[PDB]
């Protein structure tokens, strides 16, 4: 419910004579002093830089970059030929790689409403390789001021010149050059630069303190499980880092049933014997497993306007699947009945790094739209009367499962190791009464809600920064 009543002549304000509710909400009869991109920026054309294949590189594709402006690169090497990395390499070899300079602000060119703006500054010596669809601009004026302005003030203009079409909003270099920047706001920012930058520096220092005091999910799960089971972590770190095991002949045939003797299997058995020493009620997972179904994912491209698919980063240590698909498959299959994600399901990670392999998650939010879960996943249906769905995920994300899966995994490289269903059948668990499982889940949930309070304070600080910038610019 917003009526604008524009004029015909205002349609010819853009070279492609657009007319739609967006970009004409922004086009206004009132005229003010303004700046163009010639005075505030300059678009740096993309170039393909030479790279050593052996030396690892840090790469990100839109999703790794967070909305708050912190990059989460992945470290990859050319000669890995990793199974998940095949499509990334195919993209990179065609020129889909980028080396930003220092002091330049990177702007995402896909879904600008997510505010995925990144500042690259001289402070960080390490250089990050970025994907394309990032518009590097060199700020003639102080880079930090323009970074803060584009993130908060001039975001409406950037959203205006974005073109949706049939699909999702996109941004283009010419459209970016089309944006009109107010004289008064920029002049006020330049006049109060010193005070404003000092204020933002203080607020970001407070943010970094709050981030330092925050404690990670893996530590939460490990500490809760260790406290409940009285496990001593330093003892495990002493036993796990041995590299020498003296194995007796009689020890071979202990819950083995296949007479497997190997360094990895016997190390795992020794660690399990240390873990399950005081703990009782150890039981196999094959008795209480109902079924296991491996998902499968066809060829796909980032976007594609098809049925959505997940990624390997969506798995979390808390045991909750953070649903936020970035890519989709445009072509259709013959059968998709069980390839969608449902509520209250257990998903297991088959192929990943030796650390994050066998990671388990539970879908708790409302699925609504059907979404395809990739091949590197297992849907696990279990006996609900004896074992709770989230307790298994928390155990797998705990060191209890990490230690088992670092030795059971069979992979051709440390970057990807693939587990199967056979060890899931043969895995041994501490399975206390369901009351104990619910108590453990409750402790984890409360200790995670505390951390949630910490990051909500963090966005409180972020909103304070935004308010300071807006009040400085307005008057």
């Amino acid at each position: 419910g917003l009526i604008q009543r524009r004029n015909f002549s205002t349609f010819a304000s853009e070279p492609s004579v657009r007319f739609d509710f967006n970009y004409m909400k922004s086009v206004t009869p009132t005229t003010e002093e303004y700046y163009t991109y010639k005075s505030l920026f300059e678009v740096v054309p993309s170039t393909v830089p030479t790279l050593d294949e052996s030396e690892p590189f840090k790469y990100a594709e839109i999703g790794h970059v967070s909305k708050n402006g912190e990059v989460f690169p992945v470290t990859l090497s050319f000669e890995d030929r990793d199974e998940l990395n095949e499509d990334l390499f195919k993209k990179i070899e065609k020129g889909d790689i980028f080396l930003p300079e220092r002091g330049n602000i990177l702007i995402s060119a896909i879904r600008p409403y997510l505010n995925k703006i990144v500042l690259i500054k001289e402070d960080d010596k390490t250089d990050i390789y970025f994907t394309k669809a990032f518009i590097q601009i060199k700020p003639l004026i102080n880079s930090r001021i323009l970074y803060y302005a584009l993130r908060t003030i001039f975001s409406e203009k950037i959203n205006a010149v974005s073109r949706q079409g049939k699909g999702y909003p996109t941004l283009k270099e010419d459209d970016l050059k089309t944006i009109q920047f107010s004289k008064k706001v920029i002049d006020n920012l330049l006049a109060k630069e010193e005070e404003l930058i000092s204020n933002i520096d203080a607020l970001e220092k407070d943010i970094k303190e709050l981030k330092s005091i925050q404690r990670s999910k893996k530590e939460i799960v490990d500490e809760v499980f260790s406290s409940h089971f009285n496990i001593n972590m330093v003892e495990l770190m002493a036993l796990d880092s041995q590299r020498r095991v003296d194995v007796g002949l009689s020890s071979i045939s202990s819950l083995n049933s296949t007479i497997r003797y190997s360094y990895r299997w016997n190390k795992m058995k020794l660690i399990q014997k240390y873990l399950y020493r005081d703990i009782d009620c150890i039981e196999p997972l094959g008795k209480y497993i109902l079924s296991s179904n491996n998902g499968w994912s066809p060829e796909s491209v980032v976007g594609g306007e098809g049925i959505p698919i997940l990624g390997q980063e969506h798995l979390e240590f808390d045991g909750v699947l953070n649903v936020s698909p970035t890519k989709a498959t445009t072509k259709t299959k013959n059968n998709m009945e069980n390839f969608f994600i449902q509520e209250g399901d257990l998903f297991i990670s088959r192929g990943n790094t030796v650390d994050l392999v066998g990671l388990a998650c539970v879908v708790e939010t409302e699925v609504t739209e059907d979404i395809i879960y990739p091949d590197l996943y297992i849907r696990l249906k279990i006996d609900e009367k004896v074992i709770h769905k989230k307790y298994l995920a928390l155990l797998f994300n705990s060191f209890f499962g990490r230690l088992y899966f670092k030795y059971v995994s069979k992979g051709k490289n440390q970057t990807m190791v693939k587990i199967s269903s056979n060890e899931l059948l043969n895995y041994y668990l501490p399975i206390p009464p369901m009351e104990e499982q619910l108590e453990i889940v409750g402790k984890i949930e409360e200790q995670i809600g505390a951390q949630n309070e910490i990051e909500k304070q963090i966005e409180e600080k972020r909103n304070q920064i935004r308010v300071i910038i807006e009040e400085t610019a307005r008057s």
Partner: protein, 916 residues
């Protein structure tokens, strides 16, 4: 007050033998004391008692059956589930040998349609227990009821044999395989009597009420779909074929000849595989031969009615019985001739048809908003008052004919009922109105010559044609051909064909233009796929034939359909409004159409089917004079653009490329340079760069200015690619200069919520930003509302009178008798008396709410009509009153047209936009 109650009373009074009696004054029912009854029934619980009494009287008096052989209310103690239930039988008819020949169960007419599954739970168990215990042989289970045909009550019986179909799986093949519709006297074999056309005794049913129709749709859905849900294909289209065959046969039959859509059971058993399939296939062949424009014998040769493996004929035989008694083509006649079968069609349209990507139906909230935003109602009214005609409407992408159906309903419900006072009473206008709208049975008959359509799909085309038959049009205008075909290819050999005509247009480019349709409403498909065999031909009739955006050819069709002043209200995707490659089509709409409004629909308006953003374009075709002015302005400013480009490229060549300042290459440039006039040079540079320029650049020199701008010079200098419809000029520069002269305001709006949330699992409404409903009717009968509450109060007052009389008489016996054991009776009568005061108290509460409803009535309705101060309907109290509290009924769900206040987008579109 129902007349048939008096008819039944008179018929029972005329009977010689008083074996069953009813007294309405005392509300009592009396039967012969010879028949044993386990309970003393003395109160009228509903119409079921009257029906049972009438049936008993008819059986005893007319069919010469001894009343003593009939047994009522025989009690058995049965074990149901984990508890004990005590059901009783209504009617038992046994022969002289003691075998129960007839097990008749009577059900109330109110729940007759709904209570069909209970036959499994309340009848089968008793029969099984009887056969297990008493070793009896049940030959035919018989269910009897009354059927209202031509306002006459007749028998209607269903006959099921348990011996014939022992197992539940076998029973599925039966599909309403009952012996006969009506019974036979003298123990004769039941015979099904075909419905002879135009024969007074047996005919099709009219005046069908809703309560039988929603239940009918429900159980046919449950049977045919069987809980499958939505997987489309044979479950849906087969019903369409059966209904089409029914329409065809009801059309081709003559008076005195029975219908072929009837099952014959002269031999007590019909062969469902063969006899039904032969007749239905012949009927569907005749349907495709006559109703759907023949489609040539070549198509009929490969035609097939149903799928042999996929669609068993048992459901076909089941549905033949359900749909035989109904009158699909002409009957209707529900609630003073209004359509009931049409709503019976949108039910099943919404459920049985699974919709996916590439097959959408435009939601009704958007369709009616589009139709009302064009002011179609007042357009039709003004056209009828001035030109004595109705506007010509076409949907070249009709699909299920949603737009045409809602347009027909709008015109009929606006020119006749709601905005009737607008039309003139002049003799010729009155005669035209009589010819168009007056016949109540055929009020939707103007659509024969006015509504047009086009759908490329044969299945959807057939479905739309059948729906249009059901509503009342007659179809004959929904072509099942492609919408982009040349005009001469639209032939139907019927009432005058407006779509076949064509002519060349000078301003359009000497291509074919129809120009006969007043209004075009459509939802053109995204990424239409052109037919490969006709593409080389059809793409030659459009200006932008080969621009790789085939869907943008539809926007051209509208220009070829509308006449000067036609109204366009199509639903375009957002790509037309923003994408750069569509810049050509946006320069088409601007040239020929007067863009009057654009509405930005939200993302969820078509979810979950598609997530693409769409918008609404309301435009009006320009006259020839306006296009001529546009052309003259375009040429006038293109000359300036050419001369300016020449001068600017000359300057840019001189100042960096350094060509000599000779005479022959530019006269004005060399004259100004030698005369030393840089002011004119700066003026020319400014005029060329009318955009991308700032006032401060006035201080720059003729060197640094050019070296600073550079790329804008090259961008402006490049002319358009089309070069055939735009010429050798820059589209943007000349368009800006032209639109400066021809500037006019344009309404633009956005909708945040469209009143619904469509998802796979369910439906959740939200506030509707597009429009608001009336809620409060513009015409409500005070007399009817008062008479309603009067009838409930009178019905309860009869009971309060008889209960008071009986309690008084019981008190009289209490005073008379010695009260030895009568004290318990005194306590019982005291308890029922106290119940009488409690029911009187709740009746007094009913009286209080009746009085407050009356107060509301004179507060809002004066002279039995809503008065003008609430006509705009901003009153929150009235809306709250009608959204609950017995005022939920009556009510009006029509879109509210506000002439005073602007609250929703439709109000501003209807008020602040001036057409013509």
């Amino acid at each position: 007050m129902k007349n048939w109650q008096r008819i039944v009373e008179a018929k029972l009074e005329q009977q010689k033998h008083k074996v069953a009696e009813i007294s309405l004054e005392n509300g009592t029912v009396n039967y012969s004391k010879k028949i044993k009854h386990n309970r003393n029934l003395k109160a009228l619980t509903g119409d079921e008692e009257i029906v049972r009494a009438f049936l008993i009287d008819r059986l005893v008096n007319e069919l010469d059956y001894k009343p003593e052989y009939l047994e009522t209310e025989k009690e058995y103690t049965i074990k149901g589930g984990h508890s004990k239930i005590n059901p009783r039988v209504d009617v038992l008819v046994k022969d002289d040998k003691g075998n129960p020949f007839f097990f008749i169960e009577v059900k109330a007419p109110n729940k007759f349609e709904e209570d069909k599954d209970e036959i499994e739970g309340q009848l089968f168990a008793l029969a099984q227990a009887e056969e297990r215990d008493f070793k009896t042989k049940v030959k035919y289970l018989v269910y009897y009821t009354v059927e209202l045909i031509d306002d006459e009550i007749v028998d209607r019986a269903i006959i099921i044999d348990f011996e014939k179909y022992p197992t539940y799986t076998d029973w599925s093949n039966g599909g309403f395989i009952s012996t006969g519709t009506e019974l036979t006297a003298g123990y004769g074999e039941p015979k099904k009597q075909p419905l002879i056309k135009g024969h007074e005794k047996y005919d099709l049913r009219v005046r069908i009420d809703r309560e039988e129709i929603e239940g009918l749709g429900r159980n046919l859905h449950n049977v045919l779909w069987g809980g499958g849900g939505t997987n489309d294909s044979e479950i849906f289209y087969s019903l369409v074929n059966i209904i089409l065959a029914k329409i065809q046969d009801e059309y081709e039959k003559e008076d005195g000849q029975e219908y072929d859509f009837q099952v014959y059971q002269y031999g007590d058993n019909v062969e469902s595989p063969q006899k039904l399939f032969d007749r239905i296939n012949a009927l569907y062949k005749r349907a495709l031969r006559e109703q759907l424009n023949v489609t040539d014998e070549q198509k009929i040769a490969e035609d097939n009615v149903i799928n042999r493996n996929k669609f068993p004929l048992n459901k076909l035989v089941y549905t033949v019985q359900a749909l035989e008694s109904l009158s699909f083509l002409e009957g209707r006649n529900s609630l003073d001739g209004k359509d009931i079968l049409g709503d019976f069609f949108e039910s099943i349209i919404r459920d049985g048809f699974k919709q996916t990507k590439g097959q959408f139906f435009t939601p009704t909230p958007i369709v009616k908003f589009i139709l009302y935003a064009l002011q179609l109602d007042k357009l039709a009214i003004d056209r009828l008052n001035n030109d004595r005609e109705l506007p010509l409407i076409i949907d070249p992408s009709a699909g299920s004919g949603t737009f045409l159906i809602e347009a027909m309903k709008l015109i009929t419900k606006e020119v006749k009922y709601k905005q009737n006072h607008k039309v003139k009473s002049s003799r010729q206008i009155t005669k035209r109105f009589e010819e168009l709208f007056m016949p109540d049975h055929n009020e939707n008959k103007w659509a024969r010559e006015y509504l047009y359509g086009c759908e490329i799909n044969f299945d959807l085309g057939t479905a739309s044609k059948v729906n249009m038959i059901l509503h009342g049009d007659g179809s004959a205008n929904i072509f099942v051909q492609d919408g982009l075909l040349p005009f001469r290819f639209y032939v139907k050999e019927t009432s005058p064909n407006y779509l076949e005509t064509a002519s060349p247009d000078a301003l359009y480019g000497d291509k074919e233009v129809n120009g006969k349709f007043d209004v075009v409403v459509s939802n053109p498909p995204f990424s239409v796929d052109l037919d490969t065999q006709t593409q080389r031909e059809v793409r030659n009739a459009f200006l932008f034939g080969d621009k790789k955006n085939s869907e943008n050819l539809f926007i051209e069709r509208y220009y070829q359909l509308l006449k000067e002043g036609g109204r366009l209200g199509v639903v375009l995707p957002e790509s037309v409004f923003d994408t750069t490659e569509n810049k050509y089509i946006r320069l088409f709409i601007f040239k020929y159409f007067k863009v009057k409004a654009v509405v930005s629909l939200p993302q969820v308006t078509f979810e979950p089917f598609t997530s693409t953003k769409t918008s609404l374009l309301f435009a009006q075709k320009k006259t020839k004079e306006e296009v001529e002015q546009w052309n003259e302005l375009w040429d006038k400013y293109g000359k300036e653009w050419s001369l300016l480009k020449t001068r600017i490229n000359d300057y840019f060549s001189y100042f960096v490329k350094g060509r000599p300042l000779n005479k022959k290459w530019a006269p004005d440039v060399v004259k100004d340079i030698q005369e030393g006039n840089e002011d004119n040079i700066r003026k020319n540079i400014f005029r060329f760069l009318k955009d991308h320029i700032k006032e401060e650049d006035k201080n720059l020199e003729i060197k640094d200015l050019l070296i600073k701008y550079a790329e804008e010079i090259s961008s402006i200098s490049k002319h358009e690619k089309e070069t055939d419809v735009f010429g050798f000029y820059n589209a943007w520069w000349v368009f800006g200069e032209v639109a400066k002269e021809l500037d006019y305001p344009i309404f633009m709006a956005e909708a945040e919520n469209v009143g619904y949330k469509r998802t796979k699992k369910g439906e959740k409404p939200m506030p509707n930003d597009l429009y608001d409903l009336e809620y409060a009717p513009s015409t409500l009968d005070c007399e009817k509302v008062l008479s309603s509450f009067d009838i409930e109060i009178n019905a309860l007052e009869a009971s309060k009178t008889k209960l008071s009389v009986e309690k008084g008489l019981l008190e009289e016996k209490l005073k008379d008798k010695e009260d030895k054991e009568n004290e318990k009776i005194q306590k019982r009568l005291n308890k029922i008396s106290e119940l009488l005061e409690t029911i009187e108290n709740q009746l007094d509460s009913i009286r209080s709410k009746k009085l407050e409803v009356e107060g509301i009535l004179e507060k809002y309705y004066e002279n039995n009509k809503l008065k003008e101060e609430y006509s705009e309907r901003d009153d929150e109290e009235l809306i709250n009153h009608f959204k609950h509290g017995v005022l939920y009924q009556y009510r009006s769900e029509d879109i509210l047209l506000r002439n005073k206040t602007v609250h929703k987008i439709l109000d501003e579109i209807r008020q602040g936009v001036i057409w013509d």
